[PDB]
Amino acid sequence: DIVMTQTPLSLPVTPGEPASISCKSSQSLLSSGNQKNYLTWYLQKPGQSPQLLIYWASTRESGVPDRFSGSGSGTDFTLKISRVEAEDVGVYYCQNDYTYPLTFGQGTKLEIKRTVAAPSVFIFPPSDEQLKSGTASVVCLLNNFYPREAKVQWKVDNALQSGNSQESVTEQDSKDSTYSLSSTLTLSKADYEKHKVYACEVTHQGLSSPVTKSFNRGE
Amino acid sequence: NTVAAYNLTWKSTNFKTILEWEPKPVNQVYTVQISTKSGDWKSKCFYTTDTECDLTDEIVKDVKQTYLARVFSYPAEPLYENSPEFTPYLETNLGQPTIQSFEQVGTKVNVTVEDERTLVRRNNTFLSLRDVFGKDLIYTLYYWKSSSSGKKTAKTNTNEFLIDVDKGENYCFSVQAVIPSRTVNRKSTDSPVECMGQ
Amino acid sequence: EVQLVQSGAEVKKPGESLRISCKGSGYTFIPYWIEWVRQMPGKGLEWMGDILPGSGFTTYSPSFQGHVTISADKSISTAYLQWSSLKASDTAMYYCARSGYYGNSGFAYWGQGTLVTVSSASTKGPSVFPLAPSSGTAALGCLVKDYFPEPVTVSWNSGALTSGVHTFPAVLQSSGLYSLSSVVTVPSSSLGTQTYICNVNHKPSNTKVDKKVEPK
Numbered sequence: 001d002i003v004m005t006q007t008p009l010s011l012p013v014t015p016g017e018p019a020s021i022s023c024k025s026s027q028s029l030l031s032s033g034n035q036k037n038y039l040t041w042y043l044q045k046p047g048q049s050p051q052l053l054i055y056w057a058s059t060r061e062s063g064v065p066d067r068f069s070g071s072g073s074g075t076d077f078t079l080k081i082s083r084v085e086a087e088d089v090g091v092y093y094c095q096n097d098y099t100y101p102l103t104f105g106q107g108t109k110l111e112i113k114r115t116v117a118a119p120s121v122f123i124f125p126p127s128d129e130q131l132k133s134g135t136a137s138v139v140c141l142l143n144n145f146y147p148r149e150a151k152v153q154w155k156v157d158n159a160l161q162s163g164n165s166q167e168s169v170t171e172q173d174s175k176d177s178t179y180s181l182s183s184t185l186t187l188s189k190a191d192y193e194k195h196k197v198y199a200c201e202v203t204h205q206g207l208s209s210p211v212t213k214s215f216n217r218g219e
Numbered sequence: 220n221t222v223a224a225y226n227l228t229w230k231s232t233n234f235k236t237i238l239e240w241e242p243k244p245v246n247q248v249y250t251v252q253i254s255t256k257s258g259d260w261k262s263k264c265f266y267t268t269d270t271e272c273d274l275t276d277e278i279v280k281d282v283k284q285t286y287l288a289r290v291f292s293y294p295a296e297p298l299y300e301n302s303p304e305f306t307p308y309l310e311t312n313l314g315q316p317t318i319q320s321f322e323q324v325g326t327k328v329n330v331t332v333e334d335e336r337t338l339v340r341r342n343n344t345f346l347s348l349r350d351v352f353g354k355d356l357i358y359t360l361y362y363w364k365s366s367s368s369g370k371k372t373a374k375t376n377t378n379e380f381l382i383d384v385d386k387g388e389n390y391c392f393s394v395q396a397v398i399p400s401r402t403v404n405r406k407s408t409d410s411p412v413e414c415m416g417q
Numbered sequence: 418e419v420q421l422v423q424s425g426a427e428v429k430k431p432g433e434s435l436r437i438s439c440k441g442s443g444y445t446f447i448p449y450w451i452e453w454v455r456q457m458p459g460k461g462l463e464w465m466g467d468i469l470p471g472s473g474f475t476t477y478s479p480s481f482q483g484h485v486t487i488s489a490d491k492s493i494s495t496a497y498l499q500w501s502s503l504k505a506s507d508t509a510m511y512y513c514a515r516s517g518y519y520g521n522s523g524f525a526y527w528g529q530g531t532l533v534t535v536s537s538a539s540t541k542g543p544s545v546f547p548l549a550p551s552s553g554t555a556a557l558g559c560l561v562k563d564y565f566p567e568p569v570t571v572s573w574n575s576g577a578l579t580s581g582v583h584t585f586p587a588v589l590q591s592s593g594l595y596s597l598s599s600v601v602t603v604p605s606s607s608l609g610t611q612t613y614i615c616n617v618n619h620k621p622s623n624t625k626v627d628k629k630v631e632p633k
Binding site (some may be wrong): 124125127167 | 452454461462463464476478479512514517519521522523524526528530544546548549550551556558560562583585586587588590596597633
C-alpha cells in the first residue's frame, strides 16, 4: 500500500488570500514512460459527495475554476488555491491513482478564518414532561463562536462529571463564519433529585476566564 | 441487380479503425454511416467502390463510446446492413510493442518497453498507450538462454522489468502488452526478439 | 448529463445480508470502472474496490477482500455491492463512483451515497421535550430524544423560522438510540408575544410531533 500523508490536518484561511495544502506519498507516483505523476485531488463540501478537482498532479477537470492548481513530482505534491471564498470550505483529499490498491489521505479541513468570538452560553434544565418518564437531561448551548476548539465541563454540586455527556458541533456558518455546540448531561430521575446545583463550565480562546452558567433544582 | 453488404467487421489496432465488408462490387457503389448508439447517423465514405472505410477520425473523438455502422448499396427503398457493435477502448487490438533498451545492472537485467504512440489526440498531444489505459495496461516478458530449457515469465505494472540472471549467459527477450480486465483481445502480438550481443 | 443514482438508506440487524445498487446513466456503461468508497461517520475516504462492467473484472482492497462482493448487470447499467453478514462496524456512508475518460484520471462522477445502519436496535419514535428559556437575546429549543433510526427532520413554525436556528447532528447513545437538539436564538422582548413551535417528523415510525416552547 502507498501511504498518503497530508499536512496540515486543518487549515483556516481568511477570505481573499491564498491557501496551500501538501500531500506526500511513501512511494513514487511518477510513470517513466509518459512522464506523468498520477496524483488526484478531491473536494468534499459539507453534506455533499466528493468532487473531482485535479488529476495527473496538475491537470484541472473541466468546470473547476482556474484559482485551483496542482504541482509537484515523485513523492511531494501541493494543491494551491489563489483566492479562497466561502464555497471552497470542506475536506480536501489526495489520492494515489498510480497503482492498486487505491489510497486516500486523511483529509485537510479548510475553513474560513475570522476574528476570535467568545460563545454565548445557555443552560437548560430538564422539562417536567421528561421527569415523569424517569429520565433527566440537562442541555448546555454554546452559540456562535470561533475558533472550533471549546471545552464543556459539567459540574453536579461542584463535582466534575465523566462518561455521562455527549457533544455535537454544527458546520461553519456561511454568513458569519462561526460554530455552535450542544452538550447533553443524562442522569436518572433518582440521581438528579439527589443534587442541588447543576453547572456548565465553558472555556474558549476568546475567554480569559471560564464562563459558568447554572441553576438550582426546584427554582 | 444490387447486392446488400455482408460480413461487416471492424479491424482496429491502436484505435486505427477500419470497417470492412463483402462483396467486391460489380456495377454498384457503397455509402458507410456511423453513429453512437443513442446519437444520430453520419455518412463518412460516399459512393465508393472500396470494400473498406477508414473511421479513425470519428472513433478518436470518444473511445469509450459504443459505435454502430451500416453500409448502403446503390447502382452505378435502398438496401442496407448493420454492423456488430464496437466499443474501441475494450475491443481495439493492442499493436506490436517494442523493447526500448536492455541493460545489465549487476546480477540483474533491466528491460524497458517503448511507450507506444496511438492516434488518440488531446489538443497537441498524441496519447501513448499508458495515457489511454493507465492502471489497466500491463506487460509480460518472455526470456530464455542460448540452450533453451523452457521460456521463463515475468510481469510488470509499469514499463520496466527487473529479472535475476546468470553470469556469462546471453539472454534473448520478447515483450507483450496485456489488458487483463478485457473480455476480448487481452494480449498483443509479440515484440521483435532482442538478444544480448546482437 | 452523467448521473449516478444509488439505492435508498438501509437499516439492518447484525448478521444479515445486504445488497446495495448504483445505476449509471448519460454515458456508455461498459468501458468505465465503477468504484466503491466507504466513509464512516466523521472519518476519511476508504477505497473498497472496483468493477469493469464490460467483463465483470473486479479488484479489491486487501482490507475489504472476503467481506464484500462487487458485481454488475450491464444490461440495466447497474453495479452492486453486497455483504454476506453485516457487522455493527459496517455502519457508514457508501459512495459509488465512475472513473474518468483518460487513463488514471480519478473518479470523475459520484453518486449521492447510501447510508447503511447496522444495529441491534428496534424502530422507535422520538420523545420531544421543550428547552425553556429563563432570565438582549434569549435561547430556546427542542430536545429530540431516543429514536431509531436516522433521520428526523426538525423545523420551527412550519419551516418559516430559519434565521438563528441551529439544528445539531445526532449523537448515538449507549442504548443504541439517537438523540439531537434544535435551538433558536430570539429577542428577549418577543418571549411573551411570539409563539414558537418545533416540528419533529420521524418517517420510519410515522411520528408527527408539534411542541410549543414557552417560558415556565
